[PDB]
Structure formats: C-alpha cells, structure tokens
C-alpha cells in the first residue's frame with residue numbers, strides 16, 4: 150500500500166539562484182524572487198545526475214557546496230579551487246549519485262542514499278560562516294530504490310540559536326492529520342550543539358529513521374544530539390498510538406528551549422480539531 | 429541460564445509524588461517522604477499500560493512528562509495542554525506501550541522498548557528547567573519479550589555539572605561482584621554536552637547495549653557523547669576479562685572530571701576485596 | 708583480492724617512552740628521541756596480548772591508560788591504583804584482547820575489535836588534563852579476523868582547538884593516489900565538542916566505517932559530532948567516484964574551521980597532479 154522510490158538515474162537539469170533578501174538575510178531559490186530559508190528541497194534517486202545552473206545575484210562572491218553526493222573538485226564550490234561564483238556570475242554545478250554494489254575486490258560500496266544538505270562555502274569567511282548565518286542552506290534527499298515515500302517532508306534547521314533563521318518563539322509550526330506519513334529532515338548549523346526532540350513520536354537512529362523488520366538493532370529514540378553540518382532524517386505516522394494534539398518539538402538544551410527554539414507539530418483530527426490547543 | 433523478559437501487556441497501577449526536599453531540591457517517589465533524586469525506576473514490558481496516580485505536594489505547579497512511551501496529549505504533562513498539576517493536586521497519567529509489528533501497508537512499526545526517562549516540564553519555566561535542575565527526573569525501562577534481564581540496574585544522570593545532583597567528588601559509587609550482570613541507565617539533563625566513560629568495561633552502541641550475535645555491526649564503545657535529555661542503557665559483566673578493581677566511570681570532558689564528575693564501579697572478589705583499593 | 712586480517716592471538720612485546728619535548732609538549736615513542744604527537748599507532752589482532760615496557764623519561768609522574776582493550780586494574784595507569792610511573796621509572800603494562808563468542812549462559816560476548824586510543828591519566832591532574840593537552844595520546848586498532856586492511860592509516864586528533872597539537876592553519880595534510888584504500892582513525896580530546904567532516908568522501912557510522920552488504924542499515928555520513936575521548940575510524944577509496952583533488956577535511960563548527968581546524972586530503976592522479984590546486 151505504501152509508495153516506494155523507483156530506480157535512478159535520469160539526468161536532471163535545474164536552475165538555482167542566490168539572492169540577498171530585503172531584511173539582510175540570504176537565500177537560495179529555484180526562481181528569482183522566490184528564495185527561501187531553508188532553501189528548496191532537492192530530492193533525487195540513486196544513480197541520478199543533477200546539473201544545477203547556479204546564478205549568484207548578490208554583490209559578493211558566493212557558492213553552492215553539497216554533502217554526501219558525488220561531485221568532482223570543480224564542483225565543491227570552495228574559494229581555493231575557484232569553484233565559487235563571482236557577483237552576477239553563473240556556473241553549472243554537477244552532482245552525481247550512485248547505487249550500492251560490489252567492487253572488483255569483493256568489498257561493498259556504500260551508495261549515496263541519505264539525508265544530506267547543501268550550503269554556501271564562501272560568504273563572510275572561506276567556510277561560508279556568513280552565508281550559513283544569513284540562510285544559505287537547504288536539504289537534499291537521495292532515495293534508494295525501494296525506500297518508503299512520505300505524504301509530506303518538512304525541514305527543520307537548527308542554525309545557531311534559531312530554527313530556520315526565525316525569531317525566538319515564532320515556530321515554524323507544521324500540521325498533519327492523524328495517520329499522515331510525515332518526513333522530517335533535520336539539519337544543524339553554526340556554532341552550537343543541540344538536542345532535537347519530538348513529544349509523542351519516535352524514530353530509528355539509522356539511515357531512514359525506519360526499521361525494515363525485527364532484525365534491525367538500531368536504537369529507537371525521540372531525542373538526538375547534533376552539531377554543525379550534521380544531517381539526519383526520518384518518517385513517523387502522525388499521532389500513531391497517541392492520537393491528535395499540539396505536539397511540541399524543540400531543542401532540549403534547557404536555555405535553548407527557554408529562549409525560543411520551540412515549534413509545534415499540530416496533529417489534527419479529520420475534522421481539524423486538536424485536543425488542548427486554541428489559539 | 430540468562431533470565432529473559434516476558435510478553436506484556438498487563439494494566440499496572442502506581443502512585444507517585446513530587447516533594448520539595450529539606451535542602452531546596454525536588455524529587456519524585458513512590459511513597460510520600462521517600463522521594464529520591466533520581467526518581468524511582470519504572471520498568472514495564474512492551475504492551476503494558478501504566479496508570480500513574482500522581483500527586484503534586486509542592487507549593488508550585490509541577491508535572492510528569494515521559495519520553496518514548498505512548499500517551500495521549502492529555503498526559504504530556506505540559507502547561508499549554510493544562511496537563512500539569514496544581515499545588516496539592518492529583519492527576520492520573522496514562523502511559524501505554526506497544527510491541528513492534530507489520531502495519532496494514534506492509535511497513536514495520538517500531539515498538540516502545542528502550543531506555544527512556546521521565547521529568548518535570550513546568551517548574552521554573554514551561555520546559556521544566558527549575559524542575560530538572562532541582563532533581564525532578566527518573567529512569568524508565570521498557571523491555572521487549574526476550575530481552576536479557578540484569579542482576580541489578582543502576583541509574584547515572586549527568587545533570588549539568590553534577591552526577592545525580594550530588595556535590596562534586598562524591599560519586600555515587602556502585603558495587604558489584606566479578607561476574608554480576610550489571611545494567612546501567614544513562615541520562616543527561618541541563619545545559620551541557622558530556623561524554624560518559626567507564627574504565628575496563630565496554631558495550632554495544634545500539635538499543636540494548638548488547639550484541640545479539642556476530643551479524644550486528646554496531647560499534648563497540650566505552651565512551652559516548654550525550655546531550656540534554658539523551659538516554660541510553662546497556663548491560664556489562666562486572667570485571668569480565670579484566671578482574672576485580674576500583675573502576676572509575678566519569679565524564680571525559682577534561683574540566684568536568686577535574687571538577688568532580690567522577691564515580692567508582694567497585695568490583696569485588698567473592699571475598700569482598702578490591703586490588704589497589706582502600707579505606 | 709582485498710587484504711584481510713588474520714586470527715590472533717600472539718604474545719607481543721614492545722618498548723614505549725614518554726618524553727618532554729624541546730617546545731614544552733610531551734609525546735610517546737617506540738624509541739627514545741623519536742617521540743611523536745600523536746603517539747605511534749598500535750595495531751593488534753583479536754586475541755593478541757601486548758606487554759608494553761613503558762619508561763617515563765620526564766621529571767613528573769606519568770602513565771599509559773588505554774580505552775577498550777582488556778587490562779587488569781594494575782594496568783589502568785591511574786594514581787589511585789599506584790599504576791602510574793615515577794620520573795625516570797619503568798613499568799610493564801599488559802593489554803589483552805579477545806574474540807567475540809557465546810557465553811556459558813547463551814548470550815553473546817562483544818570482543819575487542821575497534822578504533823581505540825591510549826593516553827596519559829596523571830600529568831597535570833589525576834585525569835591527565837596536562838598530559839593530554841601537551842600531546843600524550845595515540846591511536847590503537849584491534850582487528851577482527853576477516854577485517855579489510857588499508858593501504859595506509861592516518862590519525863586525526865582534534866585536541867582542544869587543534870589538530871594533532873599543530874598551530875592553527877598548518878594541517879596536517881595527507882597525500883593519496885585515486886583508488887588507494889585509506890584508513891582514518893579519528894580521536895577527540897580536551898574541552899570541546901567537535902564535528903569532523905571530509906569533502907568528497909563518505910563512510911558508514913558503524914564499527915569499521917564500512918558496510919558489509921545490503922543488509923546493514925547504518926547511516927552513511929560525511930559529518931560527525933565527537934567529544935573528549937571519542938574514537939571512531941573508517942576506510943575510504945581515495946577519490947572514489949569524485950576523482951583527484953585537494954579535498955578539505957575540517958571541524959565544521961564554524962568558528963573552529965575559521966580559526967584553523969582545517970587540513971587537506973590531497974588525492975593525486977598517477978602522474979602526481981591535482982586539479983585545483985596548486986603549489
């Protein structure tokens with residue numbers, strides 16, 4: 150009954166922009182004037198190739214750098230390799246992915262599938278400390294053939310003392326209906342360690358956050374320590390075994406949650422009601 | 429020979445209290461005047477339901493909030509849900525648990541088993557920063573049918589710069605005899621990251637701390653980074669392959685151990701002696 | 708065709724020294740006057756016993772303490788057990804290791820294989836805060852029968868705000884040719900949490916950094932949070948699917964990389980050239 154990922158690989162083309170935003174932040178977008186923080190999700194299947202035509206519309210040098218995926222040195226997007234982009238410039242980055250498989254020597258090649266991310270490597274400092282602070286980051290998902298696909302995917306980025314660069318105590322909030330298969334991509338950036346926590350839900354601490362069967366010994370968790378550039382993801386069944394509610398998620402570092410690193414996973418009945426909860 | 433957990437689920441009733449202590453701290457107990465920090469261990473089998481008649485005996489609002497287990501929103505113990513308890517009041521919290529199994533859609537449902545914990549979510553702040561600092565935390569274990577049961581279970585909580593809210597350099601110490609199966613439940617709370625370390629012993633970094641057989645690829649470790657609200661647990665054979673001794677456990681963050689986050693795992697010969705140890 | 712580890716255990720002997728260095732650092736060596744920071748790599752097979760004749764050539768007390776391996780209390784290298792070594796002194800430390808297997812009771816005993824380390828436990832403080840800060844640390848590898856052996860092993864230690872006690876922005880750098888099987892042993896020490904990252908390469912988050920086959924659910928990563936005394940290790944195929952290049956590795960905690968916790972993994976073509984780069 151559950152929707153499943155197909156095999157790659159297709160060659161895919163895509164435009165991407167970096168824009169400085171009116172409030173001082175910086176964001177990526179698939180369309181000029183539609184930059185967001187986090188940047189848009191890129192999802193591919195193992196084997197796919199992605200050619201990203203990237204345009205830097207800003208007054209400063211900027212780049213696109215990615216985790217996990219196969220790229221040649223000319224596409225790591227760092228200053229050292231002159232792989233970043235001049236103001237007003239355009240460059241085509243190529244990301245590639247591969248399936249797992251046996252090497253000639255008999256060992257097993259891992260394969261690209263997982264929850265990754267992309268970000269700037271050049272604004273502010275040669276490690277993109279400025280870019281990253283301002284919002285130049287976004288999620289990437291590489292699916293393995295056979296992976297369980299969600300109804301929806303949300304991205305939660307712990308960037309310094311903010312969630313998704315939002316002001317303290319301003320979410321983001323997410324909504325689902327009891328029974329929705331919800332996917333979270335959880336990314337951390339900046340200076341601090343954090344512990345991501347979801348009330349009422351839990352996942353497996355492995356590649357997919359799901360257990361394929363009774364033989365997987367991965368810890369089942371609802372809390373997880375994370376540091377800069379760490380990424381993981383998982384799927385849950387909204388309100389499974391617990392019912393509808395305004396379920397908090399937050400960083401569990403005590404002063405962080407006290408100072409606003411909090412949001413709500415709003416799980417609704419088919420009638421839209423949530424027990425407790427107003428606003 | 430090794431005793432294993434049975435199947436649930438029974439419906440179990442329990443009473444619990446929150447008390448302010450003479451010394452300014454706060455603790456939970458199963459009986460009034462027998463509060464402890466950490467609180468008493470709650471251990472159940474997958475499928476069990478637990479109804480906790482909880483009384484807040486303090487002058488401030490307080491709550492019980494649990495990780496991992498199934499509870500409806502009315503039992504999350506947060507202020508927002510009006511799920512906490514007035515001074516002098518009594519509420520019944522329900523914790524449910526479930527076995528893993530196949531969902532209608534063919535996917536695999538995780539199951540409650542693991543090393544979890546409970547704590548206050550309301551004293552001092554809406555995240556229980558005061559509650560937690562003062563001592564309102566305790567361990568929870570949910571067993572899977574077939575899990576290996578220990579001789580004893582000890583709880584070690586790294587709460588800010590303390591172990592079990594104790595003064596620097598005052599343990600706690602634990603005693604065992606060479607050959608004893610010892611379970612540790614290891615929980616972290618507060619502001620800081622820590623690294624838990626035990627001399628002379630090691631465990632698997634998975635759900636149970638134990639490898640089922642030769643196919644489990646989990647790292648075997650004796651050191652592990654933890655943050656606020658992380659919980660894990662494991663079993664070791666006291667002095668297995670290493671003999672009797674005063675084996676330290678400590679946080680390995682250098683200034684933390686220097687400033688007192690240290691205790692002793694006292695493994696004795698059957699005669700009661702420990703090589704190279706006092707007093 | 709991939710070279711694999713044999714079964715132990717042989718009884719092995721080894722001399723090791725602690726020396727104060729001209730610039731005020733402290734290091735271990737296998738030979739007096741050839742001390743290094745990190746200390747030299749110790750590699751054994753499961754079942755091997757290692758007798759280390761350790762001489763302290765400094766004016767302060769010092770010891771050798773190891774993680775993970777089997778040692779009796781008389782070889783834990785701590786002051787409390789009078790297991791450290793007086794100035795000019797010599798002591799023989801014994802490290803044993805064991806294969807995994809079935810216990811009498813039917814459970815599975817874990818086995819020593821993994822990425823470990825050794826360090827001083829006595830210089831500066833009873834926890835070796837001075838020793839460790841000055842450079843008294845080195846790696847240990849214990850192989851399981853059948854483990855894949857690399858072309859080379861490099862040791863990367865994040866010690867406080869340094870890599871291998873080096874000056875900010877001075878590497879170390881490592882060189883390989885596309886296709887070389889490169890093993891990293893990654894160790895962390897001191898006060899700080901860190902986040903290890905390699906551009907262009909990835910590994911499995913398990914014991915060996917390698918997936919055995921398609922049944923292993925371990926997250927494949929290129930980024931990893933670590934704390935004091937954490938050790939892990941992995942194997943990668945240099946430039947696998949990405950080609951030649953000056954691939955950065957660094958701590959990804961933004962101020963850390965900015966302030967110099969950066970190195971280069973120089974993957975060369977057979978001709979010696981690196982696209983980039985250049986000297």
Ligand SMILES: [Cu+2]
Nearest residue numbers: 270906955957
């Ligand atoms: Cu980088």
Ligand SMILES: [Cu+2]
Nearest residue numbers: 343400402405
């Ligand atoms: Cu945080």
Ligand SMILES: [Cu+2]
Nearest residue numbers: 346348494495
């Ligand atoms: Cu919670």
Ligand SMILES: [Cu+2]
Nearest residue numbers: 216268378959
């Ligand atoms: Cu990065």
Ligand SMILES: [Cu+2]
Nearest residue numbers: 348397399549
């Ligand atoms: Cu909470």
Ligand SMILES: [Cu+2]
Nearest residue numbers: 622679681684
């Ligand atoms: Cu600590």
Ligand SMILES: [Cu+2]
Nearest residue numbers: 626627773774
């Ligand atoms: Cu140790």
Ligand SMILES: [Cu+2]
Nearest residue numbers: 401495547657
């Ligand atoms: Cu909590």
Ligand SMILES: [Cu+2]
Nearest residue numbers: 627676678828
């Ligand atoms: Cu120690």
Ligand SMILES: [Cu+2]
Nearest residue numbers: 901958960963
């Ligand atoms: Cu760092």
Ligand SMILES: [Cu+2]
Nearest residue numbers: 215216905906
């Ligand atoms: Cu990177």
Ligand SMILES: [Cu+2]
Nearest residue numbers: 680774826936
């Ligand atoms: Cu240590």
Ligand SMILES: [O]
Nearest residue numbers: 214270904959
């Ligand atoms: O990066």
Ligand SMILES: [O]
Nearest residue numbers: 346401493549
């Ligand atoms: O929580």
Ligand SMILES: [O]
Nearest residue numbers: 625680772828
């Ligand atoms: O240690």
